[PDB]
Short mmCIF file of C-alpha atoms (C1' of nucleotides) and ligand atoms in Angstrom, two decimals:
data_model
loop_
_atom_site.label_atom_id
_atom_site.label_comp_id
_atom_site.label_asym_id
_atom_site.label_seq_id
_atom_site.Cartn_x
_atom_site.Cartn_y
_atom_site.Cartn_z
CA UNK R 34 102.95 50.10 78.92
CA UNK R 35 103.78 52.04 75.81
CA UNK R 36 100.63 52.11 74.52
CA UNK R 37 101.52 51.05 71.11
CA UNK R 38 102.96 54.48 70.40
CA UNK R 39 106.26 54.90 68.05
CA UNK R 40 108.98 57.20 69.65
CA UNK R 41 111.56 58.12 66.89
CA UNK R 42 115.23 58.15 67.37
CA UNK R 43 116.77 61.39 68.25
CA UNK R 44 118.92 61.26 64.87
CA UNK R 45 115.85 60.41 62.84
CA UNK R 46 115.32 64.16 61.81
CA UNK R 47 111.56 64.82 62.64
CA UNK R 51 102.90 62.27 62.54
CA UNK R 52 102.67 64.04 65.72
CA UNK R 53 104.04 63.05 69.22
CA UNK R 54 101.85 62.80 72.26
CA UNK R 55 104.83 64.22 74.24
CA UNK R 56 107.43 65.78 71.87
CA UNK R 57 110.31 65.12 74.47
CA UNK R 58 111.08 61.42 75.62
CA UNK R 59 113.31 60.59 72.66
CA UNK R 60 115.65 57.47 72.13
CA UNK R 61 119.35 58.66 71.65
CA UNK R 62 121.84 56.90 69.29
CA UNK R 63 121.85 54.25 71.78
CA UNK R 64 118.64 52.08 72.82
CA UNK R 65 117.99 54.06 76.03
CA UNK R 66 115.31 56.85 76.53
CA UNK R 67 115.85 60.38 77.35
CA UNK R 68 114.19 63.44 78.11
CA UNK R 69 115.69 66.30 75.96
CA UNK R 70 114.71 68.87 78.29
CA UNK R 71 115.56 67.17 81.50
CA UNK R 72 118.61 65.44 79.93
CA UNK R 73 117.91 62.33 82.05
CA UNK R 74 118.40 58.79 80.87
CA UNK R 75 115.65 56.28 81.60
CA UNK R 76 115.99 52.49 81.41
CA UNK R 77 112.26 51.43 80.93
CA UNK R 78 109.15 53.03 79.85
CA UNK R 79 107.91 52.64 83.56
CA UNK R 80 110.82 54.83 84.24
CA UNK R 81 110.02 57.32 81.78
CA UNK R 82 106.29 57.31 83.19
CA UNK R 83 108.00 57.93 86.54
CA UNK R 84 109.82 60.86 85.14
CA UNK R 85 106.78 62.30 83.77
CA UNK R 86 104.79 61.86 86.87
CA UNK R 87 107.60 63.49 88.78
CA UNK R 88 108.11 66.99 89.68
CA UNK R 89 111.46 67.26 88.31
CA UNK R 90 110.37 66.93 84.67
CA UNK R 91 107.42 69.35 85.51
CA UNK R 92 109.80 72.08 86.83
CA UNK R 93 111.86 71.62 83.61
CA UNK R 94 108.57 72.03 81.59
CA UNK R 95 107.78 75.48 83.54
CA UNK R 96 111.17 76.60 82.88
CA UNK R 97 111.01 75.67 79.01
CA UNK R 98 107.64 77.65 78.91
CA UNK R 99 109.46 80.43 80.56
CA UNK R 100 112.00 80.12 77.89
CA UNK R 101 109.09 80.41 75.36
CA UNK R 102 107.90 83.38 76.71
CA UNK R 103 111.21 85.11 76.75
CA UNK R 104 112.27 84.26 73.32
CA UNK R 105 108.55 85.49 72.49
CA UNK R 115 88.55 59.39 102.46
CA UNK R 116 89.78 58.08 99.00
CA UNK R 117 90.10 54.62 100.42
CA UNK R 118 86.69 54.32 102.23
CA UNK R 119 84.79 55.71 98.85
CA UNK R 120 81.89 53.20 98.36
CA UNK R 121 81.10 52.27 95.08
CA UNK R 122 78.22 49.98 93.60
CA UNK R 123 79.00 51.61 90.10
CA UNK R 124 75.41 52.01 89.30
CA UNK R 125 74.41 54.29 86.09
CA UNK R 126 72.38 56.96 86.87
CA UNK R 127 69.79 58.63 84.65
CA UNK R 128 70.77 61.71 82.90
CA UNK R 129 68.63 64.19 80.95
CA UNK R 130 70.33 66.26 78.40
CA UNK R 131 68.56 69.10 76.80
CA UNK R 132 69.68 72.12 74.38
CA UNK R 133 69.13 75.30 76.29
CA UNK R 134 69.07 78.98 75.22
CA UNK R 135 69.44 82.53 76.91
CA UNK R 136 70.42 86.08 76.62
CA UNK R 149 73.42 86.35 74.56
CA UNK R 150 74.29 82.58 73.42
CA UNK R 151 73.48 79.01 73.77
CA UNK R 152 74.21 76.62 76.73
CA UNK R 153 73.60 73.19 77.90
CA UNK R 154 71.79 71.60 81.00
CA UNK R 155 71.76 68.30 82.43
CA UNK R 156 68.97 67.01 84.91
CA UNK R 157 70.49 64.03 86.86
CA UNK R 158 68.17 61.88 88.97
CA UNK R 159 69.10 59.76 91.95
CA UNK R 160 67.79 56.68 94.08
CA UNK R 161 64.24 56.89 95.57
CA UNK R 162 65.10 56.05 99.15
CA UNK R 163 65.41 52.49 98.00
CA UNK R 164 69.02 51.72 99.08
CA UNK R 165 70.24 54.73 101.02
CA UNK R 166 68.15 53.39 103.65
CA UNK R 167 71.00 51.37 105.20
CA UNK R 168 73.61 54.23 105.07
CA UNK R 169 72.95 57.67 106.91
CA UNK R 170 76.03 58.22 109.56
CA UNK R 171 76.63 61.41 108.42
CA UNK R 172 79.81 60.37 106.38
CA UNK R 173 79.84 63.13 103.63
CA UNK R 174 76.25 62.74 103.35
CA UNK R 175 75.98 66.34 103.43
CA UNK R 176 78.21 66.54 100.32
CA UNK R 177 76.39 67.11 97.00
CA UNK R 178 77.21 65.55 93.84
CA UNK R 179 80.70 67.17 91.93
CA UNK R 180 81.34 67.86 88.44
CA UNK R 181 84.57 68.57 86.85
CA UNK R 182 86.08 69.20 83.07
CA UNK R 183 88.45 66.01 82.12
CA UNK R 184 90.52 65.87 79.30
CA UNK R 185 90.41 62.55 77.27
CA UNK R 186 94.08 62.61 77.15
CA UNK R 187 94.12 60.06 79.97
CA UNK R 188 91.89 56.85 79.81
CA UNK R 189 92.18 53.20 81.05
CA UNK R 190 92.43 52.17 77.63
CA UNK R 191 94.32 55.05 76.10
CA UNK R 192 93.17 54.69 72.35
CA UNK R 193 91.40 57.70 71.15
CA UNK R 194 91.20 61.24 72.53
CA UNK R 195 90.95 65.07 72.15
CA UNK R 196 87.82 66.01 73.53
CA UNK R 197 86.51 67.05 76.93
CA UNK R 198 84.17 65.45 79.42
CA UNK R 199 81.77 66.99 81.92
CA UNK R 200 82.21 64.34 84.60
CA UNK R 201 79.50 64.15 87.43
CA UNK R 202 80.16 62.00 90.62
CA UNK R 203 78.30 61.06 93.65
CA UNK R 204 79.72 58.73 96.37
CA UNK R 205 77.66 55.58 95.90
CA UNK R 206 76.59 55.92 92.35
CA UNK R 207 78.84 55.60 89.26
CA UNK R 208 80.51 58.21 87.62
CA UNK R 209 79.00 59.99 84.43
CA UNK R 210 80.20 61.94 81.43
CA UNK R 211 79.13 64.20 78.69
CA UNK R 212 81.23 64.87 75.56
CA UNK R 213 82.05 68.71 74.89
CA UNK R 214 83.19 69.00 71.23
CA UNK R 215 82.79 72.70 71.45
CA UNK R 216 85.65 74.40 72.55
CA UNK R 217 83.51 76.90 74.66
CA UNK R 218 79.60 77.01 75.67
CA UNK R 219 78.12 78.90 78.02
CA UNK R 220 81.32 79.87 79.53
CA UNK R 221 80.14 83.19 81.09
CA UNK R 222 81.80 86.41 82.25
CA UNK R 223 81.26 87.29 85.91
CA UNK R 224 77.63 86.12 86.29
CA UNK R 225 77.48 87.03 90.14
CA UNK R 226 78.95 89.95 91.93
CA UNK R 227 82.08 88.32 93.02
CA UNK R 228 81.39 86.41 96.21
CA UNK R 229 83.87 83.97 97.53
CA UNK R 230 82.95 80.81 99.07
CA UNK R 231 84.82 78.56 96.64
CA UNK R 232 83.14 75.50 97.49
CA UNK R 233 85.28 73.22 95.09
CA UNK R 234 85.64 75.62 92.52
CA UNK R 235 84.00 78.36 90.10
CA UNK R 236 82.32 75.98 88.09
CA UNK R 237 80.16 74.15 90.83
CA UNK R 238 79.17 77.45 92.39
CA UNK R 239 78.74 79.08 89.33
CA UNK R 240 76.36 76.91 87.46
CA UNK R 241 75.26 74.10 89.55
CA UNK R 242 72.12 73.39 91.56
CA UNK R 243 71.48 70.31 94.01
CA UNK R 244 67.85 69.70 94.99
CA UNK R 245 68.66 67.49 98.01
CA UNK R 246 64.97 67.13 99.11
CA UNK R 247 64.10 65.34 95.71
CA UNK R 248 67.51 64.15 94.71
CA UNK R 249 68.11 66.01 91.54
CA UNK R 250 71.43 67.61 90.31
CA UNK R 251 70.84 70.32 87.63
CA UNK R 252 73.90 71.61 85.74
CA UNK R 253 74.24 74.32 83.30
"C1'" A K 1 107.94 25.03 79.82
"C1'" A K 2 110.30 28.54 83.87
"C1'" G K 3 114.48 29.49 87.38
"C1'" U K 4 120.62 30.60 90.12
"C1'" G K 5 125.05 33.14 93.33
"C1'" U K 6 129.41 36.36 93.58
"C1'" A K 7 131.36 41.30 93.22
"C1'" G K 8 130.10 46.01 91.00
"C1'" U K 9 127.86 49.96 87.78
"C1'" A K 10 123.96 53.12 85.71
"C1'" U K 11 119.23 55.18 85.75
"C1'" C K 12 114.19 56.71 87.47
"C1'" U K 13 111.08 58.26 91.35
"C1'" G K 14 110.09 59.36 96.39
"C1'" U K 15 111.85 62.37 100.60
"C1'" U K 16 115.27 66.72 103.01
"C1'" C K 17 116.57 72.44 103.11
"C1'" U K 18 118.85 78.36 105.39
"C1'" U K 19 116.69 83.12 111.70
"C1'" U K 20 121.32 84.96 111.91
"C1'" U K 21 126.49 84.98 112.95
"C1'" C K 22 131.24 83.38 114.74
"C1'" A K 23 135.42 79.60 115.36
"C1'" G K 24 137.24 74.54 114.22
"C1'" U K 25 137.50 70.17 110.75
"C1'" G K 26 137.01 69.66 105.93
"C1'" U K 27 137.25 71.12 100.86
"C1'" A K 28 141.01 72.71 94.93
"C1'" A K 29 137.26 76.57 96.89
"C1'" C K 30 132.88 75.20 97.97
"C1'" A K 31 129.65 71.99 100.12
"C1'" A K 32 129.16 69.25 104.27
"C1'" C K 33 130.23 68.41 109.67
"C1'" U K 34 131.48 69.99 114.72
"C1'" G K 35 130.58 73.75 118.98
"C1'" A K 36 128.62 78.52 121.23
"C1'" A K 37 124.90 82.37 121.02
"C1'" A K 38 122.58 89.12 122.79
"C1'" U K 39 120.11 92.33 124.92
"C1'" G K 40 119.33 97.30 124.74
"C1'" A K 41 119.44 102.28 122.47
"C1'" C K 42 120.29 105.68 118.02
"C1'" C K 43 121.36 107.70 112.56
"C1'" U K 44 120.61 107.91 106.40
"C1'" A K 45 122.89 98.62 103.46
"C1'" G K 46 126.04 101.12 106.29
"C1'" G K 47 128.67 102.37 112.52
"C1'" C K 48 137.55 103.45 114.32
"C1'" U K 49 129.17 103.99 117.64
"C1'" C K 50 127.83 103.28 123.03
"C1'" A K 51 126.34 100.03 127.68
"C1'" U K 52 125.60 95.41 130.57
"C1'" A K 53 130.40 105.66 158.61
"C1'" C K 54 127.33 109.74 159.39
"C1'" A K 55 123.23 114.15 158.40
"C1'" C K 56 119.11 115.82 168.37
"C1'" A K 57 124.27 120.52 171.72
"C1'" U K 58 125.24 127.79 169.44
"C1'" U K 59 125.29 129.65 161.54
"C1'" U K 60 120.74 125.95 158.11
"C1'" U K 61 116.60 119.23 159.13
"C1'" U K 62 115.57 117.16 164.69
"C1'" U K 63 112.50 123.98 166.14
"C1'" G K 64 112.10 129.31 171.86
"C1'" G K 65 107.63 128.00 170.44
"C1'" C K 66 102.82 128.38 172.16
"C1'" A K 67 98.92 132.03 172.81
"C1'" G K 68 60.39 139.97 146.94
"C1'" G K 69 64.86 138.75 150.20
"C1'" A K 70 70.62 138.46 150.83
"C1'" C K 71 76.01 139.88 149.30
"C1'" G K 72 79.54 143.23 147.09
"C1'" G K 73 80.85 148.12 144.55
"C1'" G K 74 80.08 153.26 143.35
"C1'" A K 75 77.53 158.10 144.56
"C1'" A K 76 74.74 161.62 147.55
"C1'" G K 77 72.80 163.25 152.69
"C1'" A K 78 72.66 162.83 158.22
"C1'" G K 79 74.84 161.90 163.36
"C1'" G K 80 86.87 156.97 159.25
"C1'" A K 81 90.99 160.59 160.75
"C1'" G K 82 96.71 161.77 161.98
"C1'" A K 83 102.45 160.24 161.07
"C1'" C K 84 106.33 157.09 159.10
"C1'" G K 85 107.64 154.96 155.09
"C1'" U K 86 107.87 152.31 150.37
"C1'" C K 87 106.20 151.70 144.26
"C1'" G K 88 102.42 154.10 140.82
"C1'" C K 89 98.10 158.69 136.63
"C1'" G K 90 99.28 163.60 134.63
"C1'" A K 91 103.40 167.55 133.68
"C1'" C K 92 103.68 173.51 133.01
"C1'" C K 93 109.20 169.97 133.85
"C1'" C K 94 113.98 168.07 133.65
"C1'" U K 95 116.87 166.25 130.18
"C1'" C K 96 118.26 164.56 124.00
"C1'" G K 97 119.91 159.74 122.82
"C1'" C K 98 121.69 152.31 119.92
"C1'" A K 99 123.76 150.59 123.29
"C1'" G K 100 125.96 145.76 132.99
"C1'" A K 101 129.70 149.24 131.07
"C1'" G K 102 135.01 150.43 129.59
"C1'" U K 103 140.14 148.83 127.65
"C1'" C K 104 143.46 144.76 125.64
"C1'" G K 105 145.65 139.76 123.81
"C1'" U K 106 144.46 136.48 119.80
"C1'" U K 107 141.76 135.15 115.65
"C1'" C K 108 136.49 135.20 112.57
"C1'" U K 109 134.36 134.80 117.96
"C1'" U K 110 136.21 134.59 123.44
"C1'" G K 111 140.18 134.81 128.41
"C1'" A K 112 141.98 138.28 131.53
"C1'" C K 113 141.99 143.32 134.27
"C1'" U K 114 139.26 147.57 136.84
"C1'" U K 115 134.09 150.00 138.33
"C1'" G K 116 113.28 157.83 135.80
"C1'" G K 117 114.74 162.43 139.86
"C1'" U K 118 111.40 166.59 141.37
"C1'" C K 119 105.79 168.37 142.08
"C1'" G K 120 100.61 167.51 142.40
"C1'" C K 121 96.23 162.92 142.84
"C1'" U K 122 91.91 167.49 141.17
"C1'" U K 123 89.38 162.32 146.08
"C1'" G K 124 96.84 156.45 143.13
"C1'" A K 125 98.02 151.78 145.39
"C1'" U K 126 100.35 149.16 150.52
"C1'" G K 127 102.42 147.45 155.58
"C1'" U K 128 103.30 149.43 161.02
"C1'" U K 129 101.29 152.14 164.80
"C1'" U K 130 97.45 154.73 168.55
"C1'" C K 131 92.60 156.53 169.31
"C1'" U K 132 86.67 156.56 168.62
"C1'" U K 133 76.62 153.46 161.69
"C1'" C K 134 71.61 154.40 159.45
"C1'" U K 135 68.59 156.05 154.71
"C1'" U K 136 67.85 156.43 149.08
"C1'" C K 137 69.19 155.43 143.87
"C1'" C K 138 72.00 152.73 140.39
"C1'" C K 139 74.73 147.95 138.35
"C1'" G K 140 76.37 142.78 138.84
"C1'" U K 141 75.59 137.44 141.69
"C1'" U K 142 72.44 133.70 143.96
"C1'" C K 143 67.34 131.40 145.45
ZN1 ZN O 1 111.89 65.58 81.52
#
RNA sequence: AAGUGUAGUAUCUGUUCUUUUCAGUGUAACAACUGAAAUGACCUAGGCUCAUACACAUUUUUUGGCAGGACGGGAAGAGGAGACGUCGCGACCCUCGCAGAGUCGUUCUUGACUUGGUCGCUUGAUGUUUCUUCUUCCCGUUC
């Protein structure tokens, strides 16, 4: 569960840490220096991190820094769709555009009970800091998801591309987020999802 | 090759949380627990704040009460007018000035005590009360 990381003792006088918080004191137990909470096992440590308590102390420490100045029934065939990445350009910079194609009424003929069928594909930017394997990380992914088909990701080394500035005139139908409404199109008649 | 029970401890995480008071328990004080419930008005957190039988028998109300056409002025020409009062336009007149008025006790404002008139109208306005309209011109309303 430790994912092979080495947490140095508090007295070893600090290699960069994943979270520079959880330590081991003079004794063998694990502690959160901010929260000042002792934890028996790494599982308890992860409960602490996933707990609201630790988070509140993180926000308090950030304030100190500024001062110092449906999920169940989800069908899953895990089928990799076909993406068509292509370097785009407009004006005045460079942006990316993806063309994802979906089934041709091949298997979607057995499921038509208006169960989120009206819901279009959704995209989100995920940090690689969390993976099923947790080995390497440090870059973002433009994940795209649809109920039956399997998720898809696209690595984005560049810190920022096509991140525009008030493209439209501030109209508020949040849909899912500014990203989706701002720059996505869902040709539902042909089943083609464009993203740029 | 793996493995139990008695007592007890620590540590995560999840979850809970005030509408306001009052009084009691409780507490080192808290906390916590136990009971009830203000509603209304006003002023710039606050309040010696406030509130929850008869009216019919003499002075009055059950009683002496009842009986081009029309209009409206103003003027002229022909066949409304007397009293008796009561309030006004002018003036040759009268009259000539700051105070309901006049005095005092006590205090920066109150308590007591006493007591337009005249003439015209040169066609001013009005209620008793007796008697006996037409034509023309002008200015307003209506159709
Ligand atoms: Zn913590």
